[PDB]
């Protein structure tokens, strides 16, 4: 399927 | 004291660049310009404004202040500046902002900037693939894609820039080579993002404006925005979409 | 036999100006020229035109008559009419009105005036503060305004004359001095309007034309505007909103 | 192969002219020419495009191929190509087709033209008057005459060329002589239609276009457009309107 | 009444 | 609070 990631995924 | 003249286009431009995102924001008045950023309540996407000085015809501070204003007022209220009218922003007190433009005086209570959601930090994000073009171009390339699919993928190596979409019975797909491309280190990467984003983003940029994209694989893109005549710099951060199962 | 001939815009100009209004109207075509007054179904607004003789291209007549018209029906063919158009209005018979421009001949059966709502008079008010100001102007601060509230006070002293809206969380003043206004005779006076009201008279007018403001103190306000190059007088006068228990 | 390269406004011209009545068509490249034809899913409408090689700046093909196109995706597509902005489309395989333009290319697939509804024959119609004129006009008398009525009655003789709507309280009609026409032979005819067919119709042309009207009595009517600086014809027919009881 | 009528009864 | 006034209130 298809998810929109986080933004603080990365930010973190 | 807080006492600044801009013109309307360059206030325009960061209200709107701002509110595209959230409502209300701290702005911060620094020596050496105007800072402000947020995210919006997605969680997905950050937008930091930095304005220099020298864009400003007037800038006068007597310290680094910082405020917290209600963005959908503001942006409601500069509909009725025009793009080549002078704006005055002044902060005497320490609960109220002026807006002077014409013969029009627009007062609004300030928001304790400790009441609104503190702002992100500044990420440190090194990406391989560097792109700078002209944003009026990307523009029109996303607007094309908005008609294929709800999401786009940003794909870079030695072959150049590209942006696709695709859709059940079609597709579309944007190109330039780094001698179309302003700069160009054709480093590789490959992302997906959700096309409703970049068009919001999108609305703050023209033809003329220069935009640099920094894009990696499966992560967020930079996507900065330099526009007003080079008056303002909008950098728009935004988080991709992964495929699974 | 009623036979005239005037410009796109100036027909444009009085059928909006009325229709905003009433819907049916009493058109009287005297020696000097054409005139015609209406009050809206609230008992609110009036509205008074004049258009003198020489504006028109042609003007001829062989007495004073008065026309029953459903404004409705010649506002909407109007919007079919070019600015620089030029349009005849004809009456022969006395029971159909039409309306001549480019090769198109357009007709309507006439309202017999008797049984359109007899127009009310044309009052006497003797008001302190007599403003002279750029139609257009006005047109922006109420626009500003009416992003506050949905009213407005016209404020008027020795300092100058002021429109001023007050919402829960901000403010928005509008200020001209003497210096400013193409006339002032700095008359004390102080009242409350419906800024609806107000931006409904200003879709008649735009910079350029000018606008002549007495103004009272919670008595009803006298709006003269003089547009279409000085061809077209229009009259609004506005009944007040008043504060109490 | 099918290799041809036209500038926006011919390409965006006859897919309009063509999604105007239906949503997927047969496009017929032959070596004269683009043709295409359709009758709308009412059974009362068609148009009859044409488009020779001349107009394009480029047109190459190996023989005369038949495709079968979405037209309502490639009328959402064209939106994106600018007027001034030259594209190419392009058949390789027999399954999908490439249109470019910009920094941008657009693929989609085709459709088997056997699995669309036959085209209908152009029909042989010998009609009385013959009426030559500025498109933009005719436009806009429709326009005018879509304030009044639904339908519209198309009237010639000697005397000229006529179109006229009723309303219950008032009517409208445009009229021309010969000296007003570009051409006109004073055929008698006389013919109702409906209102929206014409306005649909004329959303395709402008001032500068010509107009060929082939009218007879209570016969389908002949609009031949000729658009684009006379780089394309766009044919529509439309059935008449019949009066009974 | 008015009726529309249908284009194939010309090419008929 | 805030009402409206007539116009015949003052042509009156």
Same mark, same amino acid.
């Given at each position: 399927?298809?998810?929109?990631?986080?933004?603080?995924?990365?930010?973190? | 004291?807080?006492?600044?003249?801009?013109?309307?286009?360059?206030? %325009?431009?960061?209200?709107?660049?701002?509110? *595209?995102?959230?409502? !209300?924001? +701290? #702005?911060?008045? $620094? @020596?050496?310009?105007?800072?402000?950023?947020?995210?919006?309540?997605?969680?997905?996407?950050?937008?930091?404004?930095?304005?220099?000085?020298?864009?400003?015809?007037?800038?006068?501070?007597?310290?680094?202040?910082?405020?917290?204003?209600?963005?959908?007022?503001?942006?409601?209220?500069?509909?009725?500046?025009?793009?080549?009218?002078?704006?005055?922003?002044?902060?005497?007190?320490?609960?109220?902002?002026?807006?002077?433009?014409?013969?029009?005086?627009? %007062?609004?209570?300030?928001?304790?900037?400790? *009441?609104?959601?503190? !702002?992100? +930090? #500044?990420?440190? $994000? @090194?990406?391989?693939?560097?792109?700078?073009?002209?944003?009026?171009?990307?523009?029109?390339?996303?607007?094309?894609?908005?008609?294929?699919?709800?999401?786009?993928?940003?794909?870079?190596?030695?072959?150049?820039?590209?942006?696709?979409?695709?859709?059940?019975?079609?597709?579309?797909?944007?190109?330039?080579?780094?001698?179309?491309?302003?700069?160009?280190?054709?480093?590789?990467?490959?992302?997906?993002?959700?096309?409703?984003?970049?068009?919001?983003?999108?609305?703050?940029?023209?033809?003329?404006?220069?935009?640099?994209?920094?894009?990696?694989?499966?992560?967020?893109?930079?996507?900065?925005?330099?526009?007003?005549?080079?008056?303002?710099?909008?950098?728009?951060?935004?988080?991709?979409?992964?495929?699974?199962?």
């Amino acid at each position: 399927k298809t998810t929109q990631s986080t933004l603080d995924s990365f930010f973190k | 004291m807080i006492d600044v003249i801009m013109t309307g286009e360059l206030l %325009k431009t960061v209200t709107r660049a701002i509110v *595209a995102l959230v409502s !209300e924001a +701290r #702005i911060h008045f $620094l @020596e050496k310009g105007l800072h402000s950023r947020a995210v919006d309540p997605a969680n997905v996407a950050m937008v930091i404004v930095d304005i220099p000085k020298d864009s400003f015809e007037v800038y006068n501070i007597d310290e680094e202040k910082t405020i917290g204003v209600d963005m959908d007022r503001i942006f409601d209220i500069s509909k009725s500046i025009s793009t080549k009218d002078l704006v005055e922003l002044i902060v005497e007190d320490e609960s109220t902002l002026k807006v002077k433009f014409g013969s029009v005086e627009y %007062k609004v209570a300030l928001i304790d900037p400790s *009441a609104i959601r503190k !702002e992100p +930090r #500044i990420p440190e $994000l @090194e990406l391989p693939a560097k792109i700078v073009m002209d944003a009026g171009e990307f523009k029109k390339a996303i607007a094309a894609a908005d008609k294929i699919s709800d999401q786009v993928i940003f794909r870079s190596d030695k072959e150049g820039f590209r942006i696709e979409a695709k859709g059940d019975v079609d597709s579309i797909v944007f190109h330039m080579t780094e001698t179309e491309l302003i700069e160009f280190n054709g480093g590789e990467a490959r992302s997906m993002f959700s096309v409703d984003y970049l068009k919001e983003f999108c609305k703050v940029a023209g033809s003329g404006d220069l935009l640099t994209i920094h894009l990696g694989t499966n992560y967020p893109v930079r996507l900065v925005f330099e526009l007003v005549g080079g008056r303002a710099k909008v950098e728009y951060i935004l988080a991709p979409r992964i495929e699974s199962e």
